[PDB]
């Protein structure tokens, strides 16, 4: 029947209008988010410069552990839907980190941001210790601050806790921290990138401002906010990349809907012509049969 | 249940009453399976339905 064809046609029209509206909102969002990330950049540059200046002359976080046994990992994902492969890519990277860790033999400790990655982990029976949720593509310093506080508190409880031994630090110590997030460097494409935070190395290059003779306190007060700034930048990059991917996917959806509408219209037209011919043939045969 | 299952698809969150209704409907649908050439007496029928 052609009634189903008409229903499909109107539904496809509705979905294509929704798609164009969504993609226009998305491109406006990327336009307004590029400004925010580029405005956040200079403060990060200043923080990096002052940290490098402090490190120029003069901290368990900067001292490697004798025998690592565990490793902590962070995953970030979009809280909403309609983002093509955006979560798939970061989950692929997480899986290959897991493979590398199995090769090294160090057990992972999972941390998740966003509903999609939590849902994926639920079906595969992988334990999650802490799941932050509440992102809506627009981050703020509060979420980054609390996440950084929790992670730095957790890692500091891994020194006297030599893995299996629940020492003075307490159980669930972690020897290495890693980050997985989507990096946005150009509008054409974006690539998922892994990283590490807790292990560090000092880079030496060839070559007055001063303070009281306590630089260790300055380092211990600057490192947690360094991690907070790093995760803040990661969140901004993730938001920008998610918005761009949403734009691309929505455009593809519209370009997939239009030709389907055309094909349905053609089928409906041929069906109508066939029907007309059928009844006219039947009536003329009945008439001239007398 | 058959009318509600379609609506429940692609739903982020559902109430406990709704999911209980889905569970009961699934159990009821499962119970009604029957192989060929397996006649059942009325007494066993009413016992199974109860």
């Amino acid at each position: 029947t052609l009634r189903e064809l008409r229903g499909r046609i109107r539904s496809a029209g509705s979905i294509k209008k929704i798609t164009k509206a969504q993609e226009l909102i998305a491109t406006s969002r990327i336009a307004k988010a590029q400004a925010r990330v580029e405005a956040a950049r200079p403060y990060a540059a200043e923080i990096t410069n002052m940290l490098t200046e402090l490190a120029g002359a003069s901290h368990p976080l900067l001292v490697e552990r004798k025998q690592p046994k565990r490793a902590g990992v962070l995953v970030v994902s979009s809280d909403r839907g309609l983002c093509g492969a955006y979560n798939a890519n970061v989950l692929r990277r997480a899986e290959e980190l897991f493979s590398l860790l199995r090769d090294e033999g160090k057990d992972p400790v999972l941390y998740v941001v966003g509903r999609k990655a939590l849902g994926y982990f639920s079906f595969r029976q992988r334990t999650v210790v802490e799941s932050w949720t509440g992102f809506s593509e627009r981050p703020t310093y509060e979420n980054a601050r609390e996440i950084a506080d929790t992670l730095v508190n957790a890692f500091m409880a891994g020194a006297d806790d030599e893995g299996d031994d629940a020492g003075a630090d307490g159980i669930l110590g972690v020897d290495e921290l890693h980050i997985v997030f989507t990096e946005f460097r150009s509008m054409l494409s974006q690539t998922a990138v892994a990283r590490r935070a807790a292990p560090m190395e000092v880079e030496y290059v060839g070559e007055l401002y001063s303070f009281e003779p306590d630089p260790e306190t300055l380092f211990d007060a600057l490192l947690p906010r360094y991690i907070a700034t790093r995760v803040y930048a990661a969140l901004l990059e993730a938001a920008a990349s998610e918005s761009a991917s949403r734009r691309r996917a929505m455009k593809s959806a519209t370009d997939n809907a239009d030709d389907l509408i055309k094909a349905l219209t053609l089928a409906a037209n041929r069906e109508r012509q066939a029907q007309i011919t059928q009844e006219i043939s039947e009536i003329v045969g009945g008439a001239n049969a007398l | 249940y058959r009318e509600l299952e379609a609506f429940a698809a692609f739903a982020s969150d559902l109430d406990a009453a709704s999911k209980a209704q889905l569970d009961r409907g699934a159990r009821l649908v499962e119970l009604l399976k029957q192989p060929q050439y397996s006649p059942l007496a009325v007494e066993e029928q009413v016992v199974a339905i109860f």
Partner: peptide, 28 residues
């Protein structure tokens, strides 16, 4: 019937990149 159900229910088993800090001091 409910007594029999309760009796039988207990007797049945269930089948189921890296980061680096920058220091201006010449290398030791």
């Amino acid at each position: 019937l409910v007594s029999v159900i309760n009796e039988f229910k207990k007797g049945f088993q269930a089948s189921d990149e890296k980061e680096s800090v920058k220091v201006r001091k010449p290398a030791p």
